[PDB]
Amino acid sequence: KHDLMSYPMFPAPEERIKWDEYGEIIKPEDFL
Amino acid sequence: MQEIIASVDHIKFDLEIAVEQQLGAQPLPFPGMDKSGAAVCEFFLKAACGKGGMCPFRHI
Amino acid sequence: RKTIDYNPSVIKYLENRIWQRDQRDMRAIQPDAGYYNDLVPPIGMLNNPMNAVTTKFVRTSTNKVKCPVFVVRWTPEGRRLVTGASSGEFTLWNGLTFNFETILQAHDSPVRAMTWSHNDMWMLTADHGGYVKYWQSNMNNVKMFQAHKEAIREASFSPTDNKFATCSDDGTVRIWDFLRCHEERILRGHGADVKCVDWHPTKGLVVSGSKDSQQPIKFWDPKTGQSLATLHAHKNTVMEVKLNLNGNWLLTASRDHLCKLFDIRNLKEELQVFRGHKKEATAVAWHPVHEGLFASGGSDGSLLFWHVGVEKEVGGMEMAHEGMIWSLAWHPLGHILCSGSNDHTSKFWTRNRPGDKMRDRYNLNL
Amino acid sequence: MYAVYKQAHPPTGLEFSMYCNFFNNSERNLVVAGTSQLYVYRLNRDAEAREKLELAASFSFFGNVMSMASVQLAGAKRDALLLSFKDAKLSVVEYDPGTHDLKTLSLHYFEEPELRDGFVQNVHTPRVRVDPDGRCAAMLVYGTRLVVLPFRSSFLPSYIIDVRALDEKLLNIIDLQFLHGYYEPTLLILFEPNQTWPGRVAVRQDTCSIVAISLNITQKVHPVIWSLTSLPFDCTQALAVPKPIGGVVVFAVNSLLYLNQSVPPYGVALNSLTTGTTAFPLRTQEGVRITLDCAQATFISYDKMVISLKGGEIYVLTLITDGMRSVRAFHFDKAAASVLTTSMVTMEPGYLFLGSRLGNSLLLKYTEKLLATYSFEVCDSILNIGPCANAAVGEPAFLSEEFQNSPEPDLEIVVCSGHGKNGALSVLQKSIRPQVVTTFELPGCYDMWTVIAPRRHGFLILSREDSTMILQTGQEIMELDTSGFATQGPTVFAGNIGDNRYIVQVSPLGIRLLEGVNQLHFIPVDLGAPIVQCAVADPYVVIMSAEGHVTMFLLKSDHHRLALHKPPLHHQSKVITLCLYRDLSGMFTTEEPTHWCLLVRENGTMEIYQLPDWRLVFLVKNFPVGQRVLVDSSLPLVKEVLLVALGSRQSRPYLLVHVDQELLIYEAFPHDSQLGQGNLKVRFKKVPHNINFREGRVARFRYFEDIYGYSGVFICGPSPHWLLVTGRGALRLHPMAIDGPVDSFAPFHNVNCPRGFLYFNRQGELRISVLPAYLSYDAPWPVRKIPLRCTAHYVAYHVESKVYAVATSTNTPCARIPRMTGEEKEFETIERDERYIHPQQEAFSIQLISPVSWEAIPNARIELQEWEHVTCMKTVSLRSEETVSGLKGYVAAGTCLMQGEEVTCRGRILIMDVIEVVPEPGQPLTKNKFKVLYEKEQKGPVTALCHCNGHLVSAIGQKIFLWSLRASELTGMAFIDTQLYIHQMISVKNFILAADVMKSISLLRYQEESKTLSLVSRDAKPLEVYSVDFMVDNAQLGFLVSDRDRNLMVYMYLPEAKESFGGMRLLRRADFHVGAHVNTFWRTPCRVWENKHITWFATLDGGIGLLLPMQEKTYRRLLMLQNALTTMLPHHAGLNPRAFRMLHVDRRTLQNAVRNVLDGELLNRYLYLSTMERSELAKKIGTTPDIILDDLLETDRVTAHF
Ligand SMILES: [Zn+2]
């Protein structure tokens, strides 16, 4: 998780923002 | 300085082409607008302007 | 003449920027009256957000008709403040020397909403009759229509120029199309009169307040119309609902003398509450360049300053803005604040100067 | 759309420093660091040109270092480093023997959304602190988390301590330090539970506090002991007092506290500004009126502390100690001032290093004067292109008359570096331009040599295809026709033997000895075939024929005489090339000078022999591949090999070889490998390049000693370069692109020519040349550092009269305060106590620097008003009806008065001309003088200035005006309403591109027929722009933007795209993250690249970068390589090159990152790989290495300006 150790490199986190004419494409499960 | 070395007077940019024939300027909605502070269009002085009264650019 | 000119602070920040790299390298402003050129805007000191605690009086801006003001909003250039009162007028006050610029007459009803878009083009202003009027940046009147049969209380706007949502006293939150002026759908199932609506800055949510104690906070879905969540937060009459620009925190004032944070990623638990209003909390404004701090207006006239993570108030005082504070607005540079009373005045609040003794009537009062 | 970033100058400027056992536990090492680059130093005591810092290792990172500490782990032979990168990254690295790289031991990734606590915009940097006893190490993640690394694998699993879940509700950590003794690791923490602001002190007087948490490593429990709560409000860093006294000293801005567990709180005030702002009991320090707000300090021994204040002033604090080791009083003294530091480290006892970003980081030396008082002297300084504010491109004044008709423009850059007392100018210039003082026309001759005849060179020996020329040098050089030398045929080598007492030339038939003109004797040499090359040692001469036969000649004193000694060499394969070498600072110890021979065979094996015997000492089995580290074991074709020692007293050897039109050079480092008796204890490490060899033997690698003091190798060919190592020990490769390709080279010291050199042009022209003496070739670029002793803000080269206009500023004490009573200004004189420091008022002035001699022109200095600040200076090409063109080229200054926020800020436009007048006798520089044409107050602050087709464009307030210069006045023509604060503008062909501090860029457009200015497009998203450029392509025009989050981005105006409005929204098409801030921007055309321009920039951390536009097809062949170079290569400190060059938005909006810029410093590691490894990355992405090398090397050829 926190402690690391082909090569032990740090990750590159990226997140694509799916647009819409209302905003971001949202799912109805993460809001209850 | 920046023009003796990097001269760009012989380059015809796509910025300069897209502002002459306006290259897809959308008609402005809500026809009670003003647009005092926009560009003057060369289409009204020379040729048929087309969307007269509902053009984004001013008319002299 | 009494101005708060932001220009000698931005010049100083542009000069520091070259040879600074952080705030830990910034030379300390010392508390004396001679260190007046060493100030930077709140962009300059990014941590230590105690900079932007505006408890210094600048000017009362009163009209000639003396009507209570309900919305106070800065132009997104920071150039001026358009102010909507109960007489349906827009009184425009200059943003450097706050003397007077011009007066309009927008509505025939008390103005209740005023929102600029994410670009500096359009301005939505609703009123007490149910009318929504579009506005150019030069205060040109554009197409009007009737969006509700009763008094619209708050308008928001999606993260684009395409959709917006209004709420009124008939209990409905109606989502609108901007260009077509078309009613998309109606968000029903609320219970009583909804009084505040804020769109989410990225995700396309609609959060609504209420007076109903059984459905006080509703999360919505603009595409499907589904009631997405229900947050039983307050005992009575949620006044304002605001969201940060980071997209994580819901801030909620109400008439139960409280203000509450809510991480919208985890609605089951709750973040800290903000106790310290002696009377009802009515107005809330997040700070533009400092996430974490906001300001809070009360129904007794209290103007308090808070921070996320700090339990007590950062500091403001009661009997500051006499009456009942309806709305607050920060300048784009968070160096000055304006508030609107239920009394017939509107006061300007700037950052404190180095080396002053705060014996003013809005202060220790010695 | 598509581009490539390339780094031209590394960042100069240090932030971090320490003194640790980097290489071994025997000696300590100065390990400094800065913006994403690590430097390791040694300290030479017997240096030729007194102490001097010698570079031992230099290391580059894909990430900016935010903190750095060191600890010696259990059982370790060295001292590991604890690097710290932005947003909670930790990396533990050691020096690696074997190779000469870093070795990552541990990697720690503490950036999760549950640790950010909902705050997206991170401000707090991670702060690594270690124990004095080495028991643990602590990183302050996000200002609210303590990562604890337990020590004894060499590591125990870490655990996160929530800071706000302790006692006292810490919540705003200022500084945190471990303390001495206290059996377990004890960690002191300064914090503020109820934070206030200096400026609001009447309701929150003094809120700082201390928690000394006691860490239990095993039990993972930690109680709060020894809390205080009444510290003053403006408390900056704390410092742990060492073990015989113990405790802590706490720097505040206006006071200094000593705090201890048992001692009552003691502290004194440093000035009378703690009168109404501090209720803590503070005494009055005697004879001291200073402040400690941005101050560095370190402990010399115990009880003595040296403090570097702001202003660079050095004090020495003495802790006056009682009998029970209790601090009773303080003692200050004013020692010698120095550079505005950012770091502070004691070396060997008697030395202080002073790292600095803004100013040259220098080493000191302290001795006691005859309580103790110290005196500081300067031993060494490290050169620093500082925080580059503005930087102008100009033409140098001393181009030689032979080089005048060159097609490419000959130009240099002048950079406003440094700040304050260390403010300066930096005349950077990438390539070496010689001063040809005497030319010749000698066709036919191709090789050349200069020998020393009775240290001036006596002869010039020119080899032709059929004969040999001789030139007697001296007062006037003249061709010699007498006997001695063989002129009937060519010569393959000609050099000195002994110690400059003889001359040895090598014909293809034999070898002659010479005492000058007089020939001693001659030794014919059949040796199978004709002699192709020879190498020389001090008594040794080694011959090589065309078929690999090797013989050796030796001086024996008889009068001297060469003696044949045939080498015993087992020829399993033919010898291709040879090299000789001697030791003068011997690392060739092989378990007084020592001679060595180097021998490359055709099977690919490289062999080193100890030269008096012929025993095999070193053996690389596969040499022409180009491996990173050369290890002993006992094709592409190797052309030429040269071993040369460079540096202080010939310390470090280098290996320069030539393998298939490719230069690959090696360092050398000692390595004790117990795997044999008779082997060298050295290994060789490949180091990177920017040089390609892409268009009877001619040597390219020609060693020179003492050309203008500098010793090194000149590398001839199609792209000639100067290899230089001074006493610094840093490798320097400087190009020489003027005069085209260079065929041969020789050093040449004479009477009419000083210490200098001599080379053939490709057109067959001999050139007596001297290096120009005004530059320093010890820096990565040849630079002249111009001390101004004042902060240089803006520089602008005026093309007419060929001068520079520099805006400067010095700090004067403030004395008045402007008020406002409605009608006029009133001033209140600051009348305070005598124990009172004054605020610093800045007064500006406009210099005028001459490029001939870089002093300021006397009696040419525009001085402004009292409170007036230049916000911009550019060279402005206004129009005029006088010259043959329209444009004139004035100098315009935008300036305005800062008098606080209660006074209305107004501005003034200052248009200046530089006109040549007659000079005053005795001063040649006074021919130039300012002529102020326009000087008028404006209706608000003038914050930016540009020119559009001869119209001055200005930004007053929230409007952007457009003026026209008449005979004496400006007339307004057009304006718009704009954003909050336009601080930058640029222009190309009636298109203004403005830049706001907070909102964004906004492009404008000006019709000239109708006098109207119009907003075409803008960006609506918020963005903190620093400055703007134009990305210029064949027909595309990008809008290059630099930002506060260290981001480069390219906007385009595309009305055909649907994701904008109709021509109303700027759409970004490239996103990139340079590691530094950028304020300056340049354009120049390149050397398929038909009509493109290179957008150069200089970073604010002291480097210079590039953005070269490319086609889409060339971008995507190399983007497949960049992803292969990211994953399939190990990186220093475990950093991810993809994660570092992605966009760093500290928010969340709808703008997904458009990555269209390559990482040309990651792509530069494809040049560094061996040709066996070079083909493996080509086969996995479906290509050959010839296609990639025709793309990576062509981005180096068109980008060889300056
Ligand atoms: Zn038209």
CB pair distance less than 8 Å for A3 and D105: no
Task: Give the distance, in angstroms, between the CA of residue D476 and the centroid of all CA atoms in the same chain.
Answer: 43
The CA B35 to ligand 1 mean position distance, Å, reads 12
C-alpha distances out from residue D620 to D355, D579, D623, D632, D901, Å: 41, 16, 6, 5, 72
* Secondary structure of residue D55 in the 3-state scheme: strand
Report the alpha-carbon distance of residue C347 to residue D145 in Å, rounded.
40
Judging contact as 3 or more Cβ pairs under 8 Å, the answer for C and B is yes
CB pair distance less than 8 Å for B36 and C138: yes
CB pair distance less than 8 Å for C37 and D419: no
Ramachandran category for residue D405: left, alpha or beta (phi over 0 → left; psi -120 to 50 → alpha): alpha
Judging contact as 3 or more Cβ pairs under 8 Å, the answer for A and B is no
Report the alpha-carbon distance of residue D512 to residue D909 in Å, rounded.
76
Q: Find residue D701's DSSP bridge partners.
A: D715
Q: Find residue C123's DSSP bridge partners.
A: C116
Three-state SS for D1000-1039 is CEEEEEEECCCCEEEEEEECCCCCCEEEECCEECCCCEEE
Which residue is it, tokens 């997140």?
A: A15
H/E segment holding residue B17: helix B14-18
Shortest distance, CA B55 to any CA of chain C (angstroms) = 16
Question: A–D: how many Cβ contacts below 8 A?
Answer: 62
CB pair distance less than 8 Å for A23 and C265: no
After which residues, if any, is chain B broken (C to N > 2.5 Å)?
A: none
CB pair distance less than 8 Å for A12 and D104: no
The tokens for D475 are: 């007062």
DSSP characters for D901-939? Answer: SSS---EEEEEEEEEE-PPPTT-GGGGEEEEEEEEEE-S
| Residues of chain C with C-beta less than 8 angstroms from the C-beta of D900 | 8, 36-37
Nearest to D878 by CA among B6, B3, B19, B7: B3
Report the alpha-carbon distance of residue C314 to residue D193 in Å, rounded.
11
Q: Find residue D658's DSSP bridge partners.
A: D663
Catalogue the E-assigned strands of D966-1102. 970-977, 982-987, 992-996, 1001-1007, 1012-1018, 1025-1028, 1031-1032, 1037-1043, 1048-1052, 1067-1072, 1082-1085, 1093-1098
CB pair distance less than 8 Å for C358 and D125: no
φ, ψ at C275 (rounded to 5°): -95, 140
Please tell me if residue A10 touches chain D, with a CB cutoff of 8 Å.
yes
Burial of D1168 (0-12, 13-18, 19+ CB in 10 A): middle
Amino acid identity of residue D158, one-letter, is S
The CA B55 to ligand 1 mean position distance, Å, reads 5
H/E segment holding residue D896: strand D890-897
Report the alpha-carbon distance of residue D22 to residue D71 in Å, rounded.
10
- Helix residue spans in C5-98 (DSSP H): 7-19
DSSP characters for D68-104? Answer: EEEE--TT-SS-EEEEEETTTEEEEEEE-SSSSSEEE
Nearest to D1139 by CA among A13, C339, C259: A13
| Residues of chain D with C-beta less than 8 angstroms from the C-beta of B56 | 1062
Question: C–D: how many Cβ contacts below 8 A?
Answer: 212
Q: Find residue D108's DSSP bridge partners.
A: A3, D90
Residue to test with chain D: of A4, A7, A10, A30, most D Cβ within 10 A: A10
| Residues of chain C with C-beta less than 8 angstroms from the C-beta of A22 | 158, 162-163, 204, 222-223
Minimal Cβ distance to C292: which of D119, D236, D997 = D119
Report the alpha-carbon distance of residue C55 to residue D9 in Å, rounded.
48
Minimal Cβ distance to A12: which of D1131, D1142, D1152 = D1142
Please tell me if residue B24 touches chain C, with a CB cutoff of 8 Å.
no
CB pair distance less than 8 Å for D273 and C333: no
Edge-to-edge, what's the strand order for the sheet holding D424-428?
D391-394, D412-417, D424-428, D783-787
Stretch 65-104 of chain C: residues touching chain B, C-beta under 8 Å: none
The CA D986 to ligand 1 mean position distance, Å, reads 28
The tokens for C225 are: 């119309």
The tokens for D294 are: 């941005």
Residue D199: other Cβ atoms inside 10 A: 21
Residues near D557 by Cβ (< 8 Å), separated by ≥ 6? none
Shortest distance, CA B30 to any CA of chain D (angstroms) = 16
Please tell me if residue B26 touches chain C, with a CB cutoff of 8 Å.
no
Shortest distance, CA D1142 to any CA of chain A (angstroms) = 9
The tokens for D659 are: 């393998």
Report the alpha-carbon distance of residue C127 to residue C105 in Å, rounded.
12
CB pair distance less than 8 Å for A9 and D1148: no
Question: B–C: how many Cβ contacts below 8 A?
Answer: 16
After which residues, if any, is chain A broken (C to N > 2.5 Å)?
A: 5
Contact D1057, D1067 (CB under 8 A): yes
| Residues of chain C with C-beta less than 8 angstroms from the C-beta of B32 | 140-143
Shortest distance, CA D912 to any CA of chain C (angstroms) = 23
Residue D383: other Cβ atoms inside 10 A: 15
Report the alpha-carbon distance of residue D758 to residue C352 in Å, rounded.
70
Burial of D98 (0-12, 13-18, 19+ CB in 10 A): exposed
Contact C35, C354 (CB under 8 A): yes
Minimal Cβ distance to C50: which of D119, D171, D200 = D200
Shortest distance, CA A8 to any CA of chain D (angstroms) = 6
Q: What kind of experiment solved this structure? A: cryo-EM
H/E segment holding residue B21: none
Contact C144, C132 (CB under 8 A): yes
CB pair distance less than 8 Å for A11 and D1139: yes
Report the alpha-carbon distance of residue C308 to residue C96 in Å, rounded.
30
Chain C, nearest residue to D817 by Cα = C34
Cα-trace Rg, chain D: 33
Report the alpha-carbon distance of residue D1081 to residue D1097 in Å, rounded.
5
* Secondary structure of residue D1138 in the 3-state scheme: helix
| Residues of chain B with C-beta less than 8 angstroms from the C-beta of C134 | 30
CB pair distance less than 8 Å for B33 and C140: yes
Interface of D with B (CB under 8 A): 392-394, 409, 411, 796-797, 799, 875, 877, 976-977, 988-989, 991, 1005, 1007, 1010, 1012, 1014-1016, 1032, 1034-1037, 1053-1056, 1061-1063, 1082-1085, 1091, 1093
Q: Find residue D505's DSSP bridge partners.
A: D494, D512
Amino acid identity of residue D422, one-letter, is N
Stretch 150-189 of chain D: residues touching chain A, C-beta under 8 Å: 155, 157-158, 160
Chain A, nearest residue to D149 by Cα = A3
The CA B28 to ligand 1 mean position distance, Å, reads 11
Three-state SS for D295-355 is CEEEEECCCEEEEECCCCCEEEEEEEECCCCCEEEEECCECCCCCCCCCCEECCCCEEEEC
Domains of chain B: total: 1
The CA D953 to ligand 1 mean position distance, Å, reads 27
Minimal Cβ distance to B3: which of D877, D1063, D1082 = D877
Shortest distance, CA C175 to any CA of chain A (angstroms) = 10
Task: Give the distance, in angstroms, between the CA of residue D351 and the centroid of all CA atoms in the same chain.
Answer: 24
Report the alpha-carbon distance of residue D899 to residue D682 in Å, rounded.
65
Helices (H) and strands (E) in chain C, counts: 1, 26
Burial of D612 (0-12, 13-18, 19+ CB in 10 A): middle
* CATH number of the domain where residue D250 is located: 2.130.10.10
What resolution (Å)?
3.0
Torsion of CA C328, C329, C333, C334, to 10 degrees: 10
The tally of CA atoms less than 13 A away on the side-chain side of residue A19 is 9
Q: Find residue D704's DSSP bridge partners.
A: D712
Residue to test with chain C: of D166, D251, D981, most C Cβ within 10 A: D981
Torsion sign over Cα D324, D327, D329, D333 = positive
Torsion sign over Cα C19, C23, C27, C29 = positive
Please tell me if residue C223 touches chain A, with a CB cutoff of 8 Å.
yes
CB burial of D321-334 (b: ≥16 within 10 Å; e: otherwise) equals eeeeebbeebbbbe
Minimal Cβ distance to B19: which of D1016, D1061, D1093 = D1016
The tokens for C117 are: 């878009």
H/E segment holding residue D1141: helix D1137-1141
Three-state SS for D141-152 is ECCCEEEEEEEC
Q: Find residue D760's DSSP bridge partners.
A: D766
List the domain range (segments joined by +) for residue B12.
Answer: 1-60
Report the alpha-carbon distance of residue D478 to residue D459 in Å, rounded.
10
What is the number of residues in chain C? 366
List the domain range (segments joined by +) for residue D18.
Answer: 3-382
Which residue is it, tokens 């994660």?
A: D1139
Burial of B36 (0-12, 13-18, 19+ CB in 10 A): exposed
The CA B39 to ligand 1 mean position distance, Å, reads 9
What is the number of residues in chain A? 32
